[PDB]
Amino acid sequence: ASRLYTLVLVLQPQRVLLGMKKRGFGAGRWNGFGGKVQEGETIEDGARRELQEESGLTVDALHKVGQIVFEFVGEPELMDVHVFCTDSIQGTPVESDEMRPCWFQLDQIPFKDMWPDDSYWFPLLLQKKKFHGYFKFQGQDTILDYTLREVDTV
Ligand SMILES: CCCCCCNc1ccc2ncc(C(=O)NC)c(Nc3ccccc3)c2c1
């Protein structure tokens, strides 16, 4: 009982792109760009699609950086999130009714206004490490338990 998702971080040498989510689950937080993988779609194709749908950017090159499983108490389905990173994009970020993309300098990442798990795995992302994570949440604010380990292959 896990559902496949993707999550894309646009990480350049001095800045990262995040999107403020305007509606529904995780509204009011800065997010990477992601969503559910579709029937007959590869995980990487889904990641590329989600980046365009949510940011307006076209990815030229993607690489795998992690897998994170999320459990929410009272929710039967686990979220199996495949995380990707790129430095190489085309287009300019687009604000839509759903998302407002903004660049952040790396020492100004707005963790207080991000999912709480990000504090744990962003240090690894920023140093080009790969990882496997598991986070058990109660509601959107509380991590009950987690695991996080660096890996050589995602
Ligand atoms: C169709 C997707 C429904 C929204 C998923 C809400 N659950 C959830 C739980 C914990 C999370 N922790 C971190 C982040 C993140 O962006 N860190 C930079 C999350 N963003 C995320 C956005 C889309 C798909 C998958 C993950 C995230 C999302």
* Largest Cα–Cα separation, the chain: 40
Question: Quick one: which of 6, 91, 87, 89 has its CA closest to 46?
Answer: 6
Q: Is 91 annotated as a binding residue?
A: no
The 3-state secondary structure of 5-34, one letter per residue: EEEEEEECCCEEEEEEECCCCCCCCEECEE
* Residue 37 Cβ contacting ligand 1 at under 6 Å: no
Q: Is 13 annotated as a binding residue?
A: no
Give the resolution in Å: 1.1
Could you state, in order of their start, the residue ranges of all structural domains in the chain? 1-154
Contacts of 36 (CB under 8 A, 6+ apart): 3, 4, 5, 46
* Residue 93 Cβ contacting ligand 1 at under 6 Å: no
What is the experimental method? Answer: X-ray
